[PDB]
Amino acid sequence: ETVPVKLKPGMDGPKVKQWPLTEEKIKALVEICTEMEKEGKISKIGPENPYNTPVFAIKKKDSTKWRKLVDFRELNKRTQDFWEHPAGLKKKKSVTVLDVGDAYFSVPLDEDFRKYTAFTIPSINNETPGIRYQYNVLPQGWKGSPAIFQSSMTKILEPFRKQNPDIVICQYMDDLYVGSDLEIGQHRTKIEELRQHLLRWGELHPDKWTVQPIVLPEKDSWTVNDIQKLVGKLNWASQIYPGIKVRQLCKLLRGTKALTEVIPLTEEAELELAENREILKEPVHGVYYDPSKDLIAEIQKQGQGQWTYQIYQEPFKNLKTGKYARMRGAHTNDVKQLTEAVQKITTESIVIWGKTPKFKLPIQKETWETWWTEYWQATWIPEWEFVNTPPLVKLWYQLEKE
Amino acid sequence: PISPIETVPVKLKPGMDGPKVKQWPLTEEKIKALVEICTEMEKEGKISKIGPENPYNTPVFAIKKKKLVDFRELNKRTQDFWEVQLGIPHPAGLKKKKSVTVLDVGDAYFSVPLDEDFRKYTAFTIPSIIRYQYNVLPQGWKGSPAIFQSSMTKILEPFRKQNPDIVICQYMDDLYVGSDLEIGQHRTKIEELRQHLLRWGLTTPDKKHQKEPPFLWMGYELHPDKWTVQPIVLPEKDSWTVNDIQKLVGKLNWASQIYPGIKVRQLCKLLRGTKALTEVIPLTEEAELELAENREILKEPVHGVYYDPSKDLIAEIQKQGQGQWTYQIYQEPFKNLKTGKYARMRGAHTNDVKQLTEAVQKITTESIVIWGKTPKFKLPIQKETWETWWTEYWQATWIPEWEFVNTPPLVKLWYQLEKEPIVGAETFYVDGAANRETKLGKAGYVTNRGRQKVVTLTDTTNQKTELQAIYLALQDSGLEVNIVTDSQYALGIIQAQPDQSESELVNQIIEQLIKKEKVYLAWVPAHKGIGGNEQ
Ligand SMILES: CCOc1ccnc(CCNC(=S)Nc2ccc(Cl)cn2)c1F
């Protein structure tokens, strides 16, 4: 059957433009869609349908096969919320993700909602009008899909949830997250076991990331410049740790000495510093994850394939922070790196709070939109805006535990 | 000439109803005119005729071709459909064919069936000094196009499938068919296609009554193996008006893409201060010399070729000046597929390199539309230059496979701030401040070498001062300088090695920066105890 679904009141179907695609991707898509058409999963539509959603194709990791991807961000934003989170995986030793997008195709979609899922396969040089379709089943990448399939999902897993109430399983979108403390040996087998349990009907390490300290410089001899830079970082720091003191230091900096000038540290100053090092040894107090408010992800490009991020719902009250060292292959590609980055981070938030954060990407919209798809690999698409990395915030996070 | 294709289901925007506007009285010569013409449309396939039911009057005036309607209201109340023509096929994306024919499907609108439950919402009225409705897509109606296309689209599917080596392109009430079949072979399929479209009510012209190459396009002259920039020439004028120049400068601009070398800086001049569009402007000698010299250029047209899937795509770029770039895509050297130019301005910061980057990005997407591929790039920039630049820039940047080309002028980095203080180099502690409200401030410096300076500034802001401080420092300082400052805003600006701004002032600094041997810029927190920034 199929349960009636609706858009939140007042709202209407997405009418988002199709970004142009590469031939390679188009052929792939056309192929995919035609097959899916035959199977009756989707159907060509007419002009009376004025809605549209972007689509593209991405080859999965360790796969040479083209996967069709749709951006229902807008649509999801508009579909009625359905009111239907584990702290386990958060703490688990190891987690693996499962793509159950297929599950969804089995189930049909309310006929009256189908219109909204209209999407468009573009043609090169505008030579031919585009190829328009709409789903007949529950589409992948739709928030309504996991919801309507929720029920069936449970029973499907029960026999394992019961056979293994020692393991955890959180579902999010076309994703299935599972984490145990068993060694990768007895682990992969249970995963692959479960995996089979599913095929029947038809790594990660959460214990290694949370937040890091702000290591501070430490030299033999300090020059005016050195001292200044330091003071700069601290002052800003104080915003998180109001206990941070910078007087003793700021004294040494009195006069108009050349930057290169070397300066000896007041024993008074040494204490000052010492006290700040002490403080900065641990994440500040009073940081709570509020679920009523949105989760934020700031990312700074540190250069040399280096990238630093902070997740927070409120400024200077990060919940987590980290670094990310580019993967051998992006030897010269910033966009590749950033994407990968963005990806990990989203993935983590899911694990943690099982909820996607909104990004603040240090990159032109133009750039990001011409290529992001070309490196993307995930059933989901987070929210994002583009910004101008404030020079301060960088010099600060550049100072992370190395 | 009716079609047996199933109508598409059309609805009125939810919550709204068919029109009710009034018909405006007409001459008797126009009454008896529409009278005996409608009588036609009726027996045929178009109109019906109705009475007191479905009171959706719609205006029906008449004008001769030295019947007709107006649905403006209806349209308003009709739903929305899909994007009919997200953009036009640009020549460079075509492949050469052996033979091309275009079939004008004129009154194809009127050949397509309308949605019955909708026809209703179409009504007439013809006062005899006589009321109809529609049953087919009517000229001027919101959905006629989107629907007619779609209809056409289906009708073609089988054929397209059966005759795959035949490329049909739909545009408005026109069909563009190409192929690599020898002549007679082609003619035959054309009729096969033509008689196919007729097995559906959409009647078309006989080969005896068809259009012949070359064909005119988006300003192009098209041949089956070559396209030619439809040569163009400006008018010789005795009295130049405002509007005139505007239009000229416009038509001139279009051209500059194809014929880079065209200029208009001195014509654009003519517009400064114009009082009215119909105004008549004198012609600077510099202005004449440009017109003439531009006309010389617009003489010899441009020859070109199409896209060969077999060959790879090459895009090469040159900097026609600061922020103005020229590019040409091709496969066989000098066998241009496309050419173009971009000339962008900016904000408080930019640099050739990033600008070069933006050109590249554009070209790419442009290419992706035209060829679904991105070309290999030939960029007037040294790999090292690029390398040292991007690896350090704060924003994420990239360039698809590109390769250097020593085709000066090359885009380079006009300067680079030191990464550490310069030993044995003066150290200036600049600082600037001005009273927000009263545009008047001061900004000066003081070095370790005890040199000092401060100027009063009548009419200014804060940042103007800060930046100024820095400018000063730069002016009188020497090839090697250390500059500490507390300007959050200033930091970023300079930091990002800009080589061109909107602010003369910033530019000021840029020159200065360029001039020095080594410059280290340092930022320190504001209003704390930090020396220099204290005195
Ligand atoms: C005025 C050109 O008409 C067309 C426009 C767009 N598309 C087509 C069909 C595609 N034909 C191809 S690959 N190339 C092609 C080459 C030369 C000429 Cl004159 C027309 N078409 C056309 F025939």
Coordinates of N, CA, C and O in Angstrom, one line a residue, chain B residues 140-266:
Chain B
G140 N -1.1 32.6 -28.5 CA -1.1 33.5 -27.4 C -1.3 33.0 -26.0 O -1.1 33.6 -25.0
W141 N -1.9 31.7 -26.0 CA -2.2 31.1 -24.7 C -0.9 30.6 -23.9 O -0.1 29.9 -24.5
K142 N -0.9 30.8 -22.6 CA 0.3 30.4 -21.8 C 0.8 29.0 -22.1 O 2.0 28.9 -22.4
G143 N 0.0 28.0 -22.1 CA 0.5 26.6 -22.3 C 0.7 26.1 -23.7 O 1.2 25.0 -23.9
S144 N 0.2 26.8 -24.7 CA 0.3 26.3 -26.1 C 1.7 25.8 -26.5 O 1.8 24.7 -27.0
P145 N 2.7 26.6 -26.2 CA 4.1 26.3 -26.5 C 4.5 25.0 -25.8 O 4.8 24.0 -26.4
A146 N 4.7 25.1 -24.5 CA 5.1 24.0 -23.7 C 4.4 22.7 -24.1 O 5.1 21.6 -24.1
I147 N 3.2 22.8 -24.4 CA 2.4 21.6 -24.7 C 2.7 21.2 -26.1 O 3.0 20.0 -26.4
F148 N 2.6 22.1 -27.1 CA 3.0 21.8 -28.5 C 4.3 21.1 -28.6 O 4.5 20.1 -29.3
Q149 N 5.3 21.6 -27.8 CA 6.6 21.0 -27.9 C 6.5 19.6 -27.4 O 6.8 18.7 -28.2
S150 N 6.1 19.4 -26.2 CA 5.9 18.1 -25.6 C 5.3 17.2 -26.6 O 5.7 16.1 -26.9
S151 N 4.2 17.6 -27.2 CA 3.5 16.8 -28.1 C 4.5 16.4 -29.2 O 4.7 15.2 -29.5
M152 N 5.1 17.4 -29.8 CA 6.1 17.2 -30.8 C 7.1 16.1 -30.3 O 7.4 15.2 -31.0
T153 N 7.6 16.4 -29.1 CA 8.6 15.5 -28.5 C 8.2 14.0 -28.6 O 9.0 13.2 -29.0
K154 N 7.0 13.7 -28.2 CA 6.5 12.3 -28.2 C 6.5 11.9 -29.7 O 7.2 10.9 -30.0
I155 N 5.7 12.6 -30.5 CA 5.6 12.2 -31.9 C 6.9 11.8 -32.6 O 7.0 11.0 -33.4
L156 N 8.0 12.5 -32.1 CA 9.3 12.2 -32.7 C 10.0 11.0 -32.1 O 10.8 10.3 -32.8
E157 N 9.8 10.6 -30.9 CA 10.5 9.5 -30.2 C 10.7 8.2 -31.1 O 11.9 7.8 -31.1
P158 N 9.7 7.7 -31.7 CA 9.9 6.4 -32.4 C 10.9 6.7 -33.6 O 11.9 6.0 -33.7
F159 N 10.6 7.6 -34.4 CA 11.4 8.0 -35.5 C 12.9 8.2 -35.0 O 13.8 7.6 -35.5
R160 N 13.0 9.1 -34.1 CA 14.4 9.4 -33.6 C 15.0 8.0 -33.3 O 16.2 7.8 -33.6
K161 N 14.3 7.1 -32.7 CA 14.8 5.8 -32.3 C 15.1 5.0 -33.5 O 16.2 4.4 -33.6
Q162 N 14.2 5.0 -34.4 CA 14.4 4.2 -35.6 C 15.5 4.8 -36.6 O 16.2 4.0 -37.3
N163 N 15.7 6.1 -36.6 CA 16.6 6.7 -37.5 C 17.6 7.6 -36.6 O 17.6 8.8 -36.7
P164 N 18.4 6.9 -35.8 CA 19.4 7.4 -34.8 C 20.5 8.2 -35.3 O 21.1 9.1 -34.6
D165 N 20.9 8.0 -36.6 CA 22.0 8.8 -37.2 C 21.4 10.1 -37.7 O 22.2 10.9 -38.4
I166 N 20.1 10.4 -37.5 CA 19.5 11.6 -38.0 C 19.2 12.5 -36.7 O 18.5 12.1 -35.8
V167 N 19.8 13.7 -36.8 CA 19.6 14.6 -35.6 C 18.6 15.6 -35.8 O 18.7 16.5 -36.7
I168 N 17.5 15.5 -35.1 CA 16.4 16.5 -35.2 C 16.6 17.4 -34.0 O 17.0 16.9 -32.9
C169 N 16.4 18.7 -34.2 CA 16.4 19.7 -33.1 C 15.2 20.5 -33.2 O 14.8 21.0 -34.3
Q170 N 14.4 20.7 -32.1 CA 13.2 21.5 -32.1 C 13.5 22.9 -31.5 O 14.2 23.0 -30.5
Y171 N 12.9 23.9 -32.2 CA 13.1 25.3 -31.7 C 11.9 26.0 -32.2 O 11.7 26.2 -33.5
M172 N 11.0 26.5 -31.3 CA 9.8 27.2 -31.6 C 9.0 26.3 -32.6 O 8.8 25.1 -32.3
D173 N 8.5 26.9 -33.6 CA 7.7 26.2 -34.6 C 8.6 25.7 -35.7 O 8.2 25.6 -36.9
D174 N 9.8 25.3 -35.3 CA 10.8 24.7 -36.3 C 11.5 23.5 -35.9 O 11.8 23.2 -34.7
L175 N 11.9 22.7 -36.9 CA 12.6 21.4 -36.8 C 13.9 21.5 -37.6 O 13.9 21.8 -38.8
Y176 N 15.0 21.1 -36.9 CA 16.3 21.2 -37.5 C 16.8 19.7 -37.6 O 17.2 19.1 -36.6
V177 N 16.8 19.3 -38.9 CA 17.3 17.9 -39.2 C 18.6 17.8 -39.9 O 18.8 18.4 -40.9
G178 N 19.6 17.1 -39.4 CA 20.9 16.9 -40.0 C 21.2 15.5 -40.1 O 20.6 14.6 -39.5
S179 N 22.3 15.1 -40.9 CA 22.6 13.7 -41.1 C 23.9 13.5 -41.9 O 24.3 14.5 -42.7
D180 N 24.4 12.3 -41.9 CA 25.6 12.1 -42.7 C 25.3 11.1 -43.9 O 26.2 10.5 -44.4
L181 N 24.0 11.2 -44.3 CA 23.6 10.3 -45.4 C 23.9 11.1 -46.7 O 23.7 12.4 -46.7
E182 N 24.2 10.4 -47.7 CA 24.4 11.1 -49.0 C 23.1 11.7 -49.3 O 22.1 11.3 -48.8
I183 N 23.1 12.7 -50.2 CA 21.9 13.5 -50.6 C 20.6 12.8 -50.7 O 19.7 12.9 -49.8
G184 N 20.3 12.1 -51.8 CA 19.1 11.4 -52.1 C 18.6 10.6 -50.9 O 17.4 10.6 -50.5
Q185 N 19.6 10.0 -50.2 CA 19.4 9.2 -49.0 C 18.7 10.1 -48.0 O 17.6 9.8 -47.5
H186 N 19.3 11.2 -47.8 CA 18.7 12.2 -46.8 C 17.3 12.7 -47.2 O 16.4 12.7 -46.4
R187 N 17.1 13.2 -48.5 CA 15.9 13.7 -48.9 C 14.8 12.7 -48.6 O 13.7 13.1 -48.1
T188 N 15.0 11.4 -48.9 CA 14.1 10.4 -48.7 C 13.6 10.3 -47.2 O 12.4 10.2 -46.9
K189 N 14.5 10.3 -46.3 CA 14.2 10.2 -44.8 C 13.4 11.5 -44.4 O 12.5 11.4 -43.6
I190 N 13.8 12.6 -45.1 CA 13.2 13.8 -44.8 C 11.7 13.7 -45.1 O 10.8 14.0 -44.2
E191 N 11.3 13.2 -46.2 CA 9.9 13.0 -46.5 C 9.4 11.9 -45.6 O 8.3 12.1 -44.9
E192 N 10.1 10.8 -45.4 CA 9.6 9.8 -44.4 C 9.2 10.5 -43.1 O 8.2 10.2 -42.6
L193 N 10.1 11.4 -42.6 CA 9.9 12.2 -41.4 C 8.7 13.1 -41.5 O 7.9 13.2 -40.6
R194 N 8.6 13.7 -42.7 CA 7.6 14.7 -43.0 C 6.2 14.0 -43.1 O 5.2 14.6 -42.6
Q195 N 6.2 12.9 -43.8 CA 4.9 12.1 -43.9 C 4.5 11.5 -42.6 O 3.4 11.1 -42.4
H196 N 5.5 11.4 -41.7 CA 5.3 10.9 -40.3 C 4.6 11.9 -39.5 O 3.6 11.6 -38.8
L197 N 5.1 13.2 -39.6 CA 4.5 14.3 -38.9 C 3.1 14.6 -39.4 O 2.3 15.1 -38.7
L198 N 2.9 14.2 -40.7 CA 1.6 14.4 -41.3 C 0.6 13.3 -40.8 O -0.6 13.6 -40.8
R199 N 1.1 12.2 -40.5 CA 0.3 11.1 -40.0 C -0.2 11.4 -38.6 O -0.6 10.6 -37.8
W200 N 0.0 12.7 -38.3 CA -0.4 13.2 -37.0 C -1.0 14.6 -37.0 O -1.1 15.3 -36.0
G201 N -1.5 15.1 -38.2 CA -2.1 16.4 -38.3 C -1.2 17.6 -38.4 O -1.7 18.7 -38.8
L202 N 0.1 17.4 -38.1 CA 1.0 18.5 -38.2 C 1.5 18.5 -39.6 O 2.4 17.7 -40.0
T203 N 1.0 19.4 -40.4 CA 1.4 19.5 -41.8 C 2.6 20.4 -41.9 O 2.9 21.3 -41.2
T204 N 3.5 20.0 -42.9 CA 4.7 20.7 -43.2 C 5.0 21.0 -44.7 O 4.3 20.4 -45.6
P205 N 5.9 21.8 -45.0 CA 6.3 22.2 -46.4 C 7.0 21.2 -47.3 O 7.9 20.4 -46.8
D206 N 6.7 21.2 -48.6 CA 7.3 20.2 -49.5 C 8.7 20.7 -49.9 O 8.9 21.9 -49.9
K207 N 9.6 19.8 -50.2 CA 11.0 20.1 -50.6 C 11.1 21.3 -51.6 O 12.1 22.0 -51.6
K208 N 10.0 21.4 -52.4 CA 9.9 22.5 -53.4 C 9.7 23.8 -52.7 O 10.1 24.8 -53.1
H209 N 9.1 23.7 -51.5 CA 8.8 24.9 -50.7 C 9.5 24.9 -49.3 O 8.9 25.2 -48.3
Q210 N 10.8 24.6 -49.3 CA 11.6 24.6 -48.1 C 12.8 25.6 -48.1 O 13.1 26.2 -49.1
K211 N 13.4 25.8 -46.9 CA 14.5 26.7 -46.7 C 15.9 26.1 -47.0 O 16.2 25.0 -46.8
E212 N 16.8 27.0 -47.6 CA 18.1 26.6 -48.0 C 19.3 27.2 -47.4 O 19.4 28.5 -47.3
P213 N 20.4 26.4 -47.0 CA 21.6 26.9 -46.5 C 22.3 28.0 -47.3 O 22.0 28.1 -48.5
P214 N 23.1 28.8 -46.7 CA 23.4 28.7 -45.3 C 22.2 29.2 -44.5 O 21.2 29.7 -45.1
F215 N 22.2 29.0 -43.2 CA 21.2 29.4 -42.4 C 21.7 30.4 -41.4 O 22.8 30.3 -40.9
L216 N 20.8 31.3 -41.0 CA 21.1 32.4 -40.1 C 20.9 31.8 -38.7 O 19.9 31.1 -38.4
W217 N 21.7 32.2 -37.7 CA 21.5 31.7 -36.4 C 21.6 32.8 -35.3 O 21.0 33.9 -35.6
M218 N 22.2 32.6 -34.2 CA 22.4 33.6 -33.2 C 23.4 34.6 -33.7 O 24.4 34.9 -33.0
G219 N 23.2 35.0 -34.9 CA 24.1 36.0 -35.5 C 25.0 35.3 -36.4 O 25.9 35.8 -37.0
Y220 N 24.9 33.9 -36.5 CA 25.8 33.2 -37.3 C 25.1 32.8 -38.6 O 23.9 32.8 -38.8
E221 N 26.0 32.5 -39.6 CA 25.6 32.1 -40.9 C 26.1 30.7 -40.9 O 27.3 30.4 -40.9
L222 N 25.1 29.7 -41.0 CA 25.4 28.3 -41.0 C 25.5 27.5 -42.2 O 24.6 27.5 -43.1
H223 N 26.6 26.8 -42.4 CA 26.8 25.9 -43.5 C 27.0 24.6 -42.8 O 27.5 24.5 -41.7
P224 N 26.8 23.5 -43.6 CA 26.9 22.1 -43.1 C 28.3 21.6 -42.7 O 28.5 20.5 -42.3
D225 N 29.3 22.5 -42.9 CA 30.7 22.1 -42.6 C 31.4 23.3 -41.9 O 32.5 23.2 -41.4
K226 N 30.8 24.5 -42.1 CA 31.4 25.7 -41.6 C 30.3 26.7 -41.2 O 29.2 26.7 -41.8
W227 N 30.6 27.5 -40.2 CA 29.7 28.6 -39.8 C 30.6 29.9 -40.1 O 31.8 29.8 -40.1
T228 N 29.9 31.0 -40.3 CA 30.5 32.2 -40.6 C 29.8 33.3 -39.9 O 28.6 33.5 -39.9
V229 N 30.6 34.1 -39.1 CA 30.0 35.2 -38.4 C 29.4 36.2 -39.4 O 30.0 36.8 -40.2
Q230 N 28.0 36.1 -39.4 CA 27.2 36.9 -40.3 C 27.9 38.3 -40.3 O 27.7 39.1 -39.4
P231 N 28.7 38.6 -41.3 CA 29.5 39.9 -41.3 C 28.6 41.1 -40.9 O 27.3 41.0 -41.1
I232 N 29.1 42.1 -40.2 CA 28.3 43.2 -39.8 C 29.0 44.5 -40.0 O 30.2 44.6 -39.8
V233 N 28.2 45.6 -40.3 CA 28.8 46.9 -40.4 C 27.9 48.0 -39.9 O 26.7 48.0 -40.1
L234 N 28.6 48.9 -39.1 CA 28.0 50.0 -38.5 C 27.5 51.0 -39.5 O 28.1 51.1 -40.6
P235 N 26.5 51.8 -39.1 CA 26.0 52.9 -40.1 C 26.9 54.1 -40.1 O 27.6 54.4 -39.1
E236 N 27.0 54.8 -41.2 CA 27.7 56.1 -41.3 C 26.7 57.1 -40.9 O 25.7 57.3 -41.6
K237 N 27.0 57.9 -39.8 CA 26.0 58.9 -39.4 C 26.5 60.3 -39.5 O 27.6 60.6 -39.2
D238 N 25.5 61.2 -39.7 CA 25.7 62.6 -39.9 C 25.4 63.3 -38.5 O 26.0 64.3 -38.1
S239 N 24.3 62.7 -37.9 CA 23.9 63.3 -36.6 C 23.7 62.1 -35.6 O 22.7 61.3 -35.7
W240 N 24.6 62.0 -34.6 CA 24.6 61.0 -33.6 C 23.7 61.3 -32.4 O 24.0 62.3 -31.7
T241 N 22.8 60.5 -32.0 CA 22.0 60.8 -30.8 C 22.5 59.9 -29.7 O 23.2 58.9 -29.9
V242 N 22.0 60.2 -28.5 CA 22.3 59.5 -27.3 C 21.9 58.0 -27.6 O 22.8 57.2 -27.7
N243 N 20.6 57.8 -27.7 CA 20.2 56.5 -27.9 C 21.0 55.8 -29.0 O 21.4 54.6 -28.9
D244 N 21.3 56.5 -30.1 CA 22.1 56.0 -31.1 C 23.4 55.4 -30.6 O 23.7 54.2 -30.9
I245 N 24.2 56.2 -29.9 CA 25.4 55.7 -29.4 C 25.2 54.5 -28.5 O 25.9 53.4 -28.7
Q246 N 24.2 54.6 -27.6 CA 23.9 53.5 -26.7 C 23.8 52.2 -27.5 O 24.5 51.2 -27.2
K247 N 23.0 52.2 -28.5 CA 22.7 51.0 -29.4 C 24.0 50.6 -30.1 O 24.2 49.4 -30.4
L248 N 24.8 51.6 -30.6 CA 26.0 51.3 -31.3 C 26.9 50.6 -30.4 O 27.5 49.5 -30.7
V249 N 27.2 51.2 -29.2 CA 28.0 50.6 -28.2 C 27.6 49.2 -27.8 O 28.4 48.4 -27.5
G250 N 26.3 49.0 -27.9 CA 25.7 47.7 -27.6 C 26.1 46.8 -28.7 O 26.8 45.8 -28.4
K251 N 25.7 47.1 -29.9 CA 26.1 46.2 -31.0 C 27.6 46.0 -31.1 O 28.1 45.0 -31.5
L252 N 28.3 47.1 -30.7 CA 29.8 47.0 -30.8 C 30.3 46.0 -29.8 O 31.3 45.2 -30.0
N253 N 29.7 45.9 -28.6 CA 30.1 45.1 -27.5 C 29.9 43.6 -27.9 O 30.8 42.8 -27.7
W254 N 28.8 43.3 -28.5 CA 28.5 41.9 -29.0 C 29.6 41.4 -29.8 O 30.2 40.3 -29.6
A255 N 30.0 42.2 -30.7 CA 31.1 41.9 -31.7 C 32.5 41.6 -31.0 O 33.1 40.7 -31.4
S256 N 32.8 42.4 -30.0 CA 34.1 42.3 -29.3 C 34.4 40.8 -28.9 O 35.6 40.5 -28.8
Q257 N 33.4 40.0 -28.8 CA 33.7 38.6 -28.4 C 34.3 37.9 -29.6 O 35.3 37.2 -29.4
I258 N 33.8 38.1 -30.8 CA 34.3 37.4 -32.0 C 35.5 38.1 -32.5 O 36.5 37.5 -32.9
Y259 N 35.5 39.5 -32.6 CA 36.6 40.2 -33.1 C 37.3 41.0 -31.9 O 37.2 42.2 -31.8
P260 N 38.0 40.3 -31.1 CA 38.7 41.0 -30.0 C 39.6 42.0 -30.6 O 40.5 41.7 -31.4
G261 N 39.5 43.3 -30.2 CA 40.3 44.3 -30.8 C 39.4 45.5 -30.9 O 39.8 46.6 -30.9
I262 N 38.1 45.2 -30.8 CA 37.1 46.2 -30.9 C 37.2 47.0 -29.6 O 37.5 46.5 -28.5
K263 N 37.0 48.3 -29.7 CA 37.1 49.2 -28.5 C 35.9 50.2 -28.5 O 35.4 50.5 -29.5
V264 N 35.6 50.6 -27.3 CA 34.5 51.6 -27.1 C 34.6 52.5 -25.9 O 33.7 53.3 -25.6
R265 N 35.8 52.5 -25.3 CA 36.1 53.4 -24.2 C 35.8 54.9 -24.6 O 35.3 55.6 -23.8
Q266 N 36.2 55.2 -25.8 CA 36.0 56.6 -26.3 C 34.6 56.9 -26.8 O 34.3 58.1 -27.0

